[PDB]
Design an enzyme around this catalytic site. Structure first.
Site, PDB file in Angstrom:
ATOM      1  N   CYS A  17       0.843  -1.194   0.000  1.00 35.52           N
ATOM      2  CA  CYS A  17       0.000   0.000   0.000  1.00 35.52           C
ATOM      3  C   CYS A  17       0.882   1.250   0.000  1.00 35.52           C
ATOM      4  CB  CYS A  17      -0.974  -0.014   1.197  1.00 35.52           C
ATOM      5  SG  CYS A  17      -2.248  -1.323   1.079  1.00 35.52           S
ATOM      6  N   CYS A 122      -6.216  -5.515   3.333  1.00 39.34           N
ATOM      7  CA  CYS A 122      -5.861  -6.116   4.633  1.00 39.34           C
ATOM      8  C   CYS A 122      -6.479  -5.352   5.797  1.00 39.34           C
ATOM      9  CB  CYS A 122      -4.348  -6.141   4.854  1.00 39.34           C
ATOM     10  SG  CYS A 122      -3.468  -7.254   3.760  1.00 39.34           S
ATOM     11  N   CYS A 160      -5.583  -4.278  -3.367  1.00 40.83           N
ATOM     12  CA  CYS A 160      -4.410  -5.022  -2.946  1.00 40.83           C
ATOM     13  C   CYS A 160      -3.347  -4.965  -4.054  1.00 40.83           C
ATOM     14  CB  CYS A 160      -4.791  -6.465  -2.613  1.00 40.83           C
ATOM     15  SG  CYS A 160      -3.535  -7.399  -1.692  1.00 40.83           S
ATOM     16  N   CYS A 207     -16.363  -2.298 -18.703  1.00 35.14           N
ATOM     17  CA  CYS A 207     -15.197  -2.927 -19.315  1.00 35.14           C
ATOM     18  C   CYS A 207     -15.187  -2.781 -20.835  1.00 35.14           C
ATOM     19  CB  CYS A 207     -15.144  -4.404 -18.942  1.00 35.14           C
ATOM     20  SG  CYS A 207     -13.701  -5.265 -19.577  1.00 35.14           S
ATOM     21  N   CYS A 227     -13.062 -11.591 -24.494  1.00 31.59           N
ATOM     22  CA  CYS A 227     -13.309 -11.351 -23.079  1.00 31.59           C
ATOM     23  C   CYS A 227     -12.542 -12.382 -22.220  1.00 31.59           C
ATOM     24  CB  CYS A 227     -14.825 -11.404 -22.836  1.00 31.59           C
ATOM     25  SG  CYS A 227     -15.360 -11.695 -21.143  1.00 31.59           S
ATOM     26  N   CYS A 233     -11.770 -14.104 -14.903  1.00 31.61           N
ATOM     27  CA  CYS A 233     -12.019 -12.685 -14.599  1.00 31.61           C
ATOM     28  C   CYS A 233     -13.157 -12.473 -13.592  1.00 31.61           C
ATOM     29  CB  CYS A 233     -12.302 -11.902 -15.885  1.00 31.61           C
ATOM     30  SG  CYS A 233     -12.366 -10.113 -15.624  1.00 31.61           S
ATOM     31  N   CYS A 242     -11.072   0.938 -12.061  1.00 33.80           N
ATOM     32  CA  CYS A 242      -9.896   0.516 -12.827  1.00 33.80           C
ATOM     33  C   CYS A 242     -10.066   0.581 -14.341  1.00 33.80           C
ATOM     34  CB  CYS A 242      -9.485  -0.895 -12.428  1.00 33.80           C
ATOM     35  SG  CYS A 242      -9.163  -1.063 -10.671  1.00 33.80           S
ATOM     36  N   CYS A 254      -5.246  -4.766 -15.019  1.00 34.18           N
ATOM     37  CA  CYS A 254      -5.320  -6.220 -14.827  1.00 34.18           C
ATOM     38  C   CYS A 254      -6.093  -6.945 -15.920  1.00 34.18           C
ATOM     39  CB  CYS A 254      -5.957  -6.535 -13.478  1.00 34.18           C
ATOM     40  SG  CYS A 254      -5.151  -5.630 -12.139  1.00 34.18           S
ATOM     41  N   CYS A 260      -9.072  -9.648 -13.848  1.00 34.28           N
ATOM     42  CA  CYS A 260      -9.351  -9.022 -12.546  1.00 34.28           C
ATOM     43  C   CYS A 260      -9.482 -10.137 -11.513  1.00 34.28           C
ATOM     44  CB  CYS A 260     -10.636  -8.173 -12.614  1.00 34.28           C
ATOM     45  SG  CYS A 260     -11.154  -7.453 -11.018  1.00 34.28           S
TER      46      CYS A 260
HETATM   47  S1  SF4 Z   1     -15.584 -10.792 -17.717  1.00 35.67           S
HETATM   48 FE1  SF4 Z   1     -13.786  -9.453 -17.320  1.00 35.67          FE
HETATM   49  S2  SF4 Z   1     -12.905  -9.126 -19.434  1.00 35.67           S
HETATM   50 FE2  SF4 Z   1     -15.010  -9.914 -19.777  1.00 35.67          FE
HETATM   51  S3  SF4 Z   1     -16.266  -8.045 -20.082  1.00 35.67           S
HETATM   52 FE3  SF4 Z   1     -16.377  -8.642 -17.872  1.00 35.67          FE
HETATM   53  S4  SF4 Z   1     -14.754  -7.454 -16.762  1.00 35.67           S
HETATM   54 FE4  SF4 Z   1     -14.334  -7.398 -19.035  1.00 35.67          FE
HETATM   55  S1  SF4 Z   2      -1.318  -7.492   1.072  1.00 35.02           S
HETATM   56 FE1  SF4 Z   2      -2.402  -5.977  -0.293  1.00 35.02          FE
HETATM   57  S2  SF4 Z   2      -3.730  -4.638   1.015  1.00 35.02           S
HETATM   58 FE2  SF4 Z   2      -2.325  -5.880   2.350  1.00 35.02          FE
HETATM   59  S3  SF4 Z   2      -0.623  -4.403   2.797  1.00 35.02           S
HETATM   60 FE3  SF4 Z   2      -0.038  -5.631   0.935  1.00 35.02          FE
HETATM   61  S4  SF4 Z   2      -0.782  -4.500  -0.935  1.00 35.02           S
HETATM   62 FE4  SF4 Z   2      -1.731  -3.563   0.943  1.00 35.02          FE
HETATM   63  S1  SF4 Z   3      -8.787  -4.625 -12.121  1.00 37.81           S
HETATM   64 FE1  SF4 Z   3      -9.538  -5.949 -10.396  1.00 37.81          FE
HETATM   65  S2  SF4 Z   3      -7.629  -6.966  -9.526  1.00 37.81           S
HETATM   66 FE2  SF4 Z   3      -6.964  -5.186 -10.826  1.00 37.81          FE
HETATM   67  S3  SF4 Z   3      -6.748  -3.455  -9.385  1.00 37.81           S
HETATM   68 FE3  SF4 Z   3      -8.843  -3.299 -10.290  1.00 37.81          FE
HETATM   69  S4  SF4 Z   3     -10.139  -4.477  -8.787  1.00 37.81           S
HETATM   70 FE4  SF4 Z   3      -7.981  -5.058  -8.315  1.00 37.81          FE
END
Ligand code: SF4
Ligand code: SF4
Ligand code: SF4
Ligand code: FCO
Ligand code: CA
Ligand code: CA
Ligand code: CA
Ligand code: CL
Ligand code: NI
Ligand code: H2S
Lengths: 279, 489
Positions: A17, A122, A160, A207, A227, A233, A242, A254, A260
């Site tokens: 973090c 966390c 995270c 997305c 996809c 995902c 994101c 990601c 994701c």
């Molecule tokens: S499943 Fe994942 S890659 Fe597919 S449209 Fe949804 S968010 Fe986007």
């Molecule tokens: S494990 Fe993830 S949320 Fe926890 S301190 Fe590390 S980056 Fe931050």
């Molecule tokens: S796309 Fe999903 S896994 Fe990546 S930072 Fe965003 S929430 Fe987290």
């Protein structure tokens, strides 16, 4: 140009973090440190150590009582009387040594704070340290506050790690509120205490692969077009911006790169696992 | 006339570290290193889809997650029986190599440098030790002192942006950073495009320029002021390395080769001789004598009598061995950077061509910083080459299936030292997962035979002429670049 006083404490964290915060842009970390916040205590970067570092932390928590942000990175382990996380050692008016647990530290500093901000999954939700198989009684800030009957304004900034924009944006919004509460209301939070500013959008709904999803065009492997749903995902069950913001100053994210894994959600990781099996 | 000094938190390392020293006649005569935080990743991992491990293990550490990811995906490749393509191997090296540059830069500037450079008079640069023996105290010519301090501080500030650019480089093919998405069992998830290789290269050239023109000159200049710090923080002088950045598809050759140097002698690295002791660690072992990682056990016990750390105690042939750039550079013995060759001559009167030409000076506080700076340059030379080798469009991923029953081990070097992940699979789930990490080898406590860990041993003899300002204790510790999240996991 009064800076926000910050005491940044680490429990069962990985320092990710903090590292993500170091990646901030607009403003960058130099301007954050010199112009935006006063980072009074932070174990990874501060000049002083040991007795001097802790004495300074406590002096700030006293001088700025009700007027500093307690930033928490990492979970709070409650098993074995808190002994899975020792954050420092204190010395009495006599010469003797006393270890300080993460539980003791948070119980001490939270009531002194203006607000507590749990950065990362966390601290916000338990995350990986609190996942199935752990034996440390690892707990989130919200659960620890509930167990301790601590009523202190708490804002969660999960991920995270979280994107630096989420951490900086939330902290700036909180400080603006304190300085002028009617001009700058606190960001609206969802049921899990995280700001809708950053965690209101569903990844999947926003997305760029949604057209492909709709036409049943699924990537057969990571390096094929389509996809990412069949690769695991978790965009469908994840709420963060994101897809708009992307990562590391817009370089990638990601879902484009891979999948994701739902890292911002209160059930990360167990509710998002296995990572490479579809939802 | 012994005096005890206890430092907890020992700040400007990653994670939770306590250092205790006994001082007599102005020198450290005994020491204890303690890691005070435990999560138990090896327990958390049990029963999961083995593929999840390369995401879970990254959360051991947000400074070096690519190292853990690399070790994990290699363990999985081994267990699953899949061979990575040429382009997959190179892409993995580009993702990871960009974080080697980030990590060393982060360490020297943002963790180490405040023991030498006087920052501005605002938190978190103050408070600091009253007699901190900084550049501004050491250099007696006031203008030179100011100029040298400003030179160092401006590099600290610039390095904030340079390390951020390194993370843009990691994200290029890794998805984001900290905690990449782009490395998986079977290779890498995104094939490099010509455009994205060029965008990585442009950023890389800026990082490389900083390394050669700013970082290396600063380190050699710093050492020329603190010549006494090449003469202390010595330790066991035993080092181990596993090999990092494979340069061919059969992992026969590396940028930095595996090897062991113990008691003045080179030997090959034999993984069968690694074992962990827990006599002074908060863990229970089912059998005496230390355990090889392939039968490692993680049964935490904070009530264990006589124990003082959550870090286990790895030994090689029952010898404490240290790890990191000093270890790798000593084992490989590469040619020094042109800057190093030049500045060693100009500033010290030292003729040196290869790393080992530093001799005794390598095994010291300043030797560890020099090794790290030189390795940053050496890694940049490699990345520059890999950027020419990578082939836009060439497949980086090979499909695989989770095996019912298997084992695999991934060997690499994290920026801080030797790293392996051992993976055992049963009924398609993680049966055992054992991590032997870098700072684990450095910041461990005494083994069952009372042999001090490397940092503990290296503290012996460190000068403490001012007990209220024991700056050399932290300087020694930070020269190892400890990560206590990695050490304990
Ligand atoms: S499943 Fe994942 S890659 Fe597919 S449209 Fe949804 S968010 Fe986007
Ligand atoms: S494990 Fe993830 S949320 Fe926890 S301190 Fe590390 S980056 Fe931050
Ligand atoms: S796309 Fe999903 S896994 Fe990546 S930072 Fe965003 S929430 Fe987290
Ligand atoms: N570098 C790094 Fe982290 C440590 N120590 C690992 O492995
Ligand atoms: Ca209470
Ligand atoms: Ca104890
Ligand atoms: Ca281990
Ligand atoms: Cl960013
Ligand atoms: Ni680490
Ligand atoms: S790393």
């Amino acid at each position: 140009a009064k800076k926000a006083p910050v005491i940044w404490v680490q429990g069962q964290g990985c320092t990710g973090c903090s590292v993500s915060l170091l990646n901030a842009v607009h403003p960058r970390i130099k301007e954050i440190l010199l112009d935006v916040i006063s980072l009074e205590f932070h174990p990874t970067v501060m000049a002083s150590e040991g007795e001097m570092a802790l004495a300074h932390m406590y002096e700030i928590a006293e001088k700025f009582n009700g007027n500093f942000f307690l930033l928490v990175e990492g979970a709070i382990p409650t098993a074995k009387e808190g002994r899975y996380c020792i954050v420092g050692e204190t010395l009495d008016a006599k010469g003797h040594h006393h270890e300080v647990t993460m539980m003791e530290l948070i119980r001490d500093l939270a009531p002194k704070s203006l607000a507590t901000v749990a950065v990362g999954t966390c601290s916000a939700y338990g995350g990986i340290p609190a996942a199935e198989g752990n034996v440390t009684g690892s707990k989130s800030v919200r659960d620890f506050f509930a167990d301790e009957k601590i009523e202190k304004l708490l804002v969660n900034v999960p991920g995270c790690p979280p994107h630096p924009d989420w951490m900086v944006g939330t902290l700036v919004a909180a400080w603006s509120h304190v300085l002028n509460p009617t001009e700058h209301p606190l960001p609206e939070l969802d049921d899990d205490g995280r700001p809708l500013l950053f965690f209101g959008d569903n990844i999947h709904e926003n997305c760029p692969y949604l057209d492909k999803y709709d036409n049943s065009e699924f990537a057969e492997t990571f390096t094929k077009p389509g996809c990412k749903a069949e690769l695991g995902c978790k965009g469908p069950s994840t709420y963060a911006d994101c897809a708009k913001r992307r990562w590391n100053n817009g370089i990638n994210w990601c879902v484009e790169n891979a999948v994701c894994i739902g890292c911002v959600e209160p059930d990360f990781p167990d509710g998002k696992s296995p990572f490479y099996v579809a939802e | 006339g012994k005096v005890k000094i206890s430092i907890d938190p020992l700040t400007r390392v990653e994670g939770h570290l306590k250092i205790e020293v006994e001082v007599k006649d102005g020198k450290v005569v005994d020491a204890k290193c303690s890691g005070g935080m435990f999560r138990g990743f090896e327990q958390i991992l049990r029963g999961r889809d083995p593929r999840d491990s390369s995401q879970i293990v990254q959360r051991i550490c947000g400074v070096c997650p690519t190292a853990h990811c690399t070790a994990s995906v290699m363990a999985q490749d081994d267990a699953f029986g899949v061979k990575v393509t040429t382009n997959g191997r190179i892409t993995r090296n580009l993702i990871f190599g960009a974080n080697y540059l980030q990590s060393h830069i982060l360490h020297f500037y943002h963790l180490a440098a405040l023991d030498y450079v006087k920052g501005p008079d605002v938190s978190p640069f103050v408070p600091r030790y009253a007699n901190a023996d900084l550049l501004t105290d050491r250099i007696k010519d006031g203008a030179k002192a100011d100029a040298t301090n400003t030179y160092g501080l401006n590099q600290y500030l610039k390095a904030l942006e340079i390390r951020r650019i390194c993370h843009e480089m990691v994200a290029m093919f890794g998805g984001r950073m900290p905690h990449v998405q782009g490395m998986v069992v079977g290779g890498a998830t995104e094939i490099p495009t010509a455009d994205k290789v060029a965008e990585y290269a442009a950023r890389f050239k800026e990082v490389q320029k900083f390394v050669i023109e700013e970082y290396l000159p600063l380190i050699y200049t710093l050492g020329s002021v603190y010549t006494d710090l090449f003469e202390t923080g010595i330790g066991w002088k035993n080092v181990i390395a596993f090999g990092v950045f494979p340069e061919d598809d059969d992992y026969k050759t590396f940028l930095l080769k595996p090897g062991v140097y113990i008691d003045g002698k080179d030997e090959e690295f034999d993984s069968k001789l690694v074992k962990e002791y827990v006599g002074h660690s908060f863990f229970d072992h089912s059998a005496p004598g230390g355990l090889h990682y392939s039968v490692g056990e993680t049964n935490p016990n904070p009530d264990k009598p006589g124990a003082y750390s959550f870090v286990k105690a790895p030994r090689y042939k029952d010898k404490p061995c240290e790890v990191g750039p000093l270890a790798r550079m000593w084992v490989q013995n590469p040619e020094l950077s042109p800057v190093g060759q030049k500045l060693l001559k100009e500033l010290y009167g030292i003729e040196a061509k290869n790393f080992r030409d530093l001799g005794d000076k390598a095994f010291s506080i300043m030797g560890r910083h020099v090794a790290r700076a030189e390795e940053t340059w050496l890694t940049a030379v490699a990345v520059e080459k890999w950027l020419k080798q990578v082939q836009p469009g060439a497949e980086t991923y090979v499909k695989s299936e989770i095996p019912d029953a298997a084992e695999g081990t991934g060997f690499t070097e994290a920026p801080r030292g030797a790293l392996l992940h051992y993976l055992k699979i049963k009924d398609k789930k993680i049966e055992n997962y054992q991590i032997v990490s870098a700072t684990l080898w450095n910041a461990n406590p005494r083994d069952d035979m009372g042999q001090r860990g490397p940092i503990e041993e290296a503290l012996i003899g460190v000068p403490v002429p001012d007990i209220k300002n024991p700056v050399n204790v932290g300087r020694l510790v930070r020269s190892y670049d400890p990560x206590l999240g990695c050490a304990v996991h």
